[PDB]
Amino acid sequence: APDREKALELAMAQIDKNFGKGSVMRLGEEVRQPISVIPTGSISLDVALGIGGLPRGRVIEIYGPESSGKTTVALHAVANAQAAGGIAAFIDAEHALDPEYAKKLGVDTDSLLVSQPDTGEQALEIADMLVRSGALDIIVIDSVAALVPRAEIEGEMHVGLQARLMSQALRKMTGALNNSGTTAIFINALRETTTGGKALKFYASVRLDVRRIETLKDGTDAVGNRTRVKVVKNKVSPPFKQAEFDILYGQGISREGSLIDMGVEHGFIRKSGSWFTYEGEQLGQGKENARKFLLENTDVANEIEKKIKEKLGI
Numbered sequence: 001a002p003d004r005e006k007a008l009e010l011a012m013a014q015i016d017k018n019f020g021k022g023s024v025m026r027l028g029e030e031v032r033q034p035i036s037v038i039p040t041g042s043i044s045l046d047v048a049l050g051i052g053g054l055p056r057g058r059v060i061e062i063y064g065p066e067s068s069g070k071t072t073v074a075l076h077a078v079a080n081a082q083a084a085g086g087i088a089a090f091i092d093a094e095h096a097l098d099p100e101y102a103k104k105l106g107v108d109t110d111s112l113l114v115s116q117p118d119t120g121e122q123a124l125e126i127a128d129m130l131v132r133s134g135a136l137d138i139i140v141i142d143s144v145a146a147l148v149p150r151a152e153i154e155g156e157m158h159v160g161l162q163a164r165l166m167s168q169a170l171r172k173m174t175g176a177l178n179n180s181g182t183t184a185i186f187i188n189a190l191r192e193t194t195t196g197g198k199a200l201k202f203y204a205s206v207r208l209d210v211r212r213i214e215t216l217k218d219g220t221d222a223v224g225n226r227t228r229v230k231v232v233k234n235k236v237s238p239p240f241k242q243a244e245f246d247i248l249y250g251q252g253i254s255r256e257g258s259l260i261d262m263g264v265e266h267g268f269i270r271k272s273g274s275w276f277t278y279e280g281e282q283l284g285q286g287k288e289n290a291r292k293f294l295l296e297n298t299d300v301a302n303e304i305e306k307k308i309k310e311k312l313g314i
């Protein structure tokens, strides 16, 4: 009577039904759940996510050391939800946002709702209220850590409160997020759990481990920094995939850079040691020269984007 593959699928099906699609998956499964997404700003990360971007109506955690590139991704996500006509909100407990930098990443600052709460409770309630209006495509909360409880803020001499705070708010908010379809990005700067990163680990549909890995030099001097993101949790597509990309000083994710990495790995652009070539024409010697080439030769790149796009999904 026993036929494993048969029994297994019956079990997996039963599992998803009882707990939700994505409760169990084969790591190599080719996901076919289009959903609705907010492109990450990084083509590769969109691919790593398996669905083309951050899922809508879900809790997203983006953690890692400072200057890891978390905020950049958050800002790009906002920029993209806006181009699609979405409205964005920013719950700020850090007072670090640099609107001029955000504009550069394409964010329409003037339309950005910003709120600087007095307490963690207040910050999450304001977020809950904004979300339940169903009017937002995305909402980013700067600093899970910054969400300190009112009592602490007022000198209360008694603990476990800030994590409990993140739990209860997350319990209430997820419902509205799904109904509204608003993607909520919690930025968690570390020094995976910043007091309340505890409940966030379970409530999230996606958790991004962001980390700096290399300083982009090309020549002796610095041009920017390369970031590596690992999708440690993904309840909508097989997890653990990884992605890398360049964020040049004063710029967001380098599109050209992403086109040069995927293009090389997917054979569209050949790379003999030190020289990048594309179907019968030189791009230059050195990751950076190629970037320069693609920045200028806008016609190229678009086709390379085209090809890389078609090859996976546009």
Ligand SMILES: Nc1ncnc2c1ncn2[C@@H]1O[C@H](COP(=O)(O)OP(=O)(O)OP(O)(O)=S)[C@@H](O)[C@H]1O
Residues within 6 Å of the ligand: 064, 065, 066, 067, 068, 069, 070, 071, 072, 073, 096, 098, 101, 189, 210, 224, 225, 247, 248, 249, 250, 251
């Ligand atoms: N205001 C800015 N002005 C110029 N460059 C910036 C600015 N913000 C970010 N960048 C660029 O992107 C990098 C920092 O990215 P962030 O997303 O701010 O890092 P992070 O991981 O979010 O660190 P935290 O704790 O949020 S600051 C910088 O090293 C620059 O390359």
Ligand SMILES: [Cl-]
Residues within 6 Å of the ligand: 039, 040, 041, 042, 043, 046
């Ligand atoms: Cl994107």
